[PDB]
Amino acid sequence: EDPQLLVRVRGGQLRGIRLKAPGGPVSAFLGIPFAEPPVGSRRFMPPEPKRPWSGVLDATTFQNVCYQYVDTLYPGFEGTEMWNPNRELSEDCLYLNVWTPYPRPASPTPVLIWIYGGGFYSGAASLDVYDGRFLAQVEGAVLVSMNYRVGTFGFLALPGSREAPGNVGLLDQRLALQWVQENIAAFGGDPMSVTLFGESAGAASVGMHILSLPSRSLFHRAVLQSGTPNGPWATVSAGEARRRATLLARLVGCPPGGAGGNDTELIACLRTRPAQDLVDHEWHVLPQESIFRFSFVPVVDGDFLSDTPEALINTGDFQDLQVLVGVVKDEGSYFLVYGVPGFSKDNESLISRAQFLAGVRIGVPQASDLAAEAVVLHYTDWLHPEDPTHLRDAMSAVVGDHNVVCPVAQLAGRLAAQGARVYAYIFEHRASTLTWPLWMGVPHGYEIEFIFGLPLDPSLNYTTEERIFAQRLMKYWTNFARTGDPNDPRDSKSPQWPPYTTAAQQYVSLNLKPLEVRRGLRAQTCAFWNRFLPKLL
Amino acid sequence: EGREDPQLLVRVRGGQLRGIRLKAPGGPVSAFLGIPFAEPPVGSRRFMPPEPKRPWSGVLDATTFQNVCYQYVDTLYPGFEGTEMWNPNRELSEDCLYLNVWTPYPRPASPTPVLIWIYGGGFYSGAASLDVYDGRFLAQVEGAVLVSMNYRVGTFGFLALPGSREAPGNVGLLDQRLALQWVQENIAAFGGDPMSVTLFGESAGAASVGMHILSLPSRSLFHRAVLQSGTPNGPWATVSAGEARRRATLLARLVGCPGNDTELIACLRTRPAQDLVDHEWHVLPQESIFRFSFVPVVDGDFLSDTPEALINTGDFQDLQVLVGVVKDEGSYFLVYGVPGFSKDNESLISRAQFLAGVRIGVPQASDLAAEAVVLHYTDWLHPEDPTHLRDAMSAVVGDHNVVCPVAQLAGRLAAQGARVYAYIFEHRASTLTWPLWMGVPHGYEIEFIFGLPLDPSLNYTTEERIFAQRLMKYWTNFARTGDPNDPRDSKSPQWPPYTTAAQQYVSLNLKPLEVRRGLRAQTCAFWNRFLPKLLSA
Rg (CA), chain B: 23
Name the 3-class secondary structure at B135: coil
Question: Residue B398: which region, alpha, beta or left (left: phi > 0; alpha: psi -120 to 50)?
Answer: alpha
- Size of chain B in residues: 537
Give yes or no for a contact between B388 and B396, defined as CB atoms under 8 angstroms apart: no
Which residues face B399 on adjacent strands? none
User: Angle at the Cα of A76 (from A71 to A81), degrees rounded to 5?
Assistant: 50
**Residue B534 sits at the chain A interface (C-beta within 8 Å):** yes
Give yes or no for a contact between B361 and B393, defined as CB atoms under 8 angstroms apart: yes
Nearest residue to A48 (alpha-carbon basis) of A59, A67, A35: A35
DSSP B254-307: HHT----HHHHHHHHHTS-HHHHHHHGGGG-SSS-SS--SS--B--SSSSSS-H
**Residue A537 sits at the chain B interface (C-beta within 8 Å):** no
Tell me the CATH number at B254: 3.40.50.1820
Nearest residue to A327 (alpha-carbon basis) of A408, A231, A230: A408
Q: Please say whether the dihedral angle defined by the alpha carbons of residues B248, B249, B250 and B251, taken in this order, is positive or negative.
A: positive
Rounded to the nearest 10°, the torsion over CA B485, B490, B496, B497 is 50
Integer Cα distance of B294 and A86 in angstroms: 77
- Interface mutation vs chain B, best among A377, A379, A381, A525, most B CBs within 10 Å: A377
Decide if B426 is catalytic: no
Task: List CB contacts (< 8 A) between B530 and chain A.
Answer: 373-374, 377
Which residues face B321 on adjacent strands? B225, B420
Which structural technique was applied? Answer: X-ray
Integer Cα distance of B283 and A425 in angstroms: 55
Q: Which amino acid is at A414?
A: R
Integer Cα distance of B246 and B250 in angstroms: 6
User: Angle at the Cα of A440 (from A436 to A442), degrees rounded to 5?
Assistant: 90
Question: At B125, phi and psi to the nearest 5?
Answer: -150, 175
Task: List CB contacts (< 8 A) between A526 and chain B.
Answer: 380
Name the 3-class secondary structure at B479: helix
Name the 3-class secondary structure at A32: strand
The number of folded domains in chain A is 1
Half-sphere exposure of A28 (CA within 13 A, CB side): 21
Decide if B129 is catalytic: no
A 459-478 → B contacts, CB under 8 A: none
C-alpha pair distances (Å), A259 with each of A245, A246, A271: 13, 9, 16
Give yes or no for a contact between A61 and A70, defined as CB atoms under 8 angstroms apart: no
Q: Are strands B59-61 and B27-36 parallel, antiparallel or unpaired?
A: unpaired
Half-sphere exposure of A295 (CA within 13 A, CB side): 26
A453 DSSP 8-state letter: T
Give yes or no for a contact between B192 and B103, defined as CB atoms under 8 angstroms apart: yes
Give yes or no for a contact between B87 and B74, defined as CB atoms under 8 angstroms apart: yes
Give yes or no for a contact between B433 and B77, defined as CB atoms under 8 angstroms apart: no
| Residue burial B167-196, b: 16+ Cβ < 10 Å; e: rest | bbbbbbbbbbbbbbbbbbebbbebbbbbeb
Give yes or no for a contact between B114 and B101, defined as CB atoms under 8 angstroms apart: no
Q: Across the interface, do B375 and A505 touch by the CB < 8 Å criterion?
A: no
Q: Which amino acid is at A503?
A: A
Give the H or E element holding residue B32: strand B27-36
Contacts of residue A344, Cβ cutoff 8 Å, sequence gap at least 6: A337
Q: Which domain holds residue A285?
A: 1-537
Rg (CA), chain A: 23
Give yes or no for a contact between A255 and A434, defined as CB atoms under 8 angstroms apart: no
Contacts of residue A468, Cβ cutoff 8 Å, sequence gap at least 6: none
Integer Cα distance of B19 and A227 in angstroms: 80
Among the listed residues B212, B427, B442, B447, the single catalytic one is B442
Nearest residue to A165 (alpha-carbon basis) of A280, A305, A311: A305
Tell me whether residue B399 is exposed, middle or buried, using C-beta atoms within 10 angstroms of its C-beta: 0 to 12, 13 to 18, 19 or more: buried
- Interface mutation vs chain A, best among B355, B367, B377, B380, most A CBs within 10 Å: B380
**Residue A520 sits at the chain B interface (C-beta within 8 Å):** yes
Integer Cα distance of A138 and A385 in angstroms: 50
Integer Cα distance of A413 and B408 in angstroms: 38
Beta carbons within 10 angstroms of residue B418's beta carbon: 21
Name the 3-class secondary structure at A488: coil
